[PDB]
Design a protein around this ligand. Sequence first.
Ligand SMILES: *C/C=C/c1ccc2c(c1)C(C)(C)c1cc(N(CC)CC)ccc1-2
Length: 133
Amino acid sequence: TRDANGTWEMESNENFEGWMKALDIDFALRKIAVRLTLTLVIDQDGDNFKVKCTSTFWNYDVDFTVGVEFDEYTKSLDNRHVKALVTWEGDVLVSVQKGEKENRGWKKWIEGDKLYLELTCGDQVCRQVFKKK
Ligand SMILES: *C/C=C/c1ccc2c(c1)C(C)(C)c1cc(N(CC)CC)ccc1-2
C-alpha cells in the first residue's frame, strides 16, 4: 500500500470541474481539461518522488522529498506560490500546500494496482481513481 511507482491510467474523475474552479482556472480551459486523457507517472525511491501528470496540452511535473517542505510555483496550473509538504499518515500519502487557498493539497491511497487520489481546494474535493498499467 506504500509503493506508488508506475504508470497510472485514469478510471474515474469526479468533481474535476469544481476543484479546478476553486483554483480559479479559466472557464474556457477547464472545459478542455475535462476532455483530456490524464496519465500519472510516478518514480519513487525511498523518500524521493518524481511525479509527472501528462495530457495532450498540459503537463504538471513535481519532485519532492517526503518530510521536507518545499517552495512550489504551480506554473502550469493556477500559477500560485505555495509551501508544500508531503508526509505519510499511516499508509496514506498526504500533501498540504500552504498559501492563499484553504484546505489545499491532496491525499493518495495506494491499494495494490489501484491508486485513489483526492485533490482538495477550499470546499471542493475531486476524487480520482487510476489503475497501474
Ligand atoms: C499524487 C498526485 C498528485 C497530483 C498533483 C497534481 C496533479 C495531479 C496529481 C493530476 C494528475 C490530477 C493533475 C492534473 C492536472 N491537469 C488538469 C488541470 C492536467 C495536466 C494538473 C495537475 C495535476
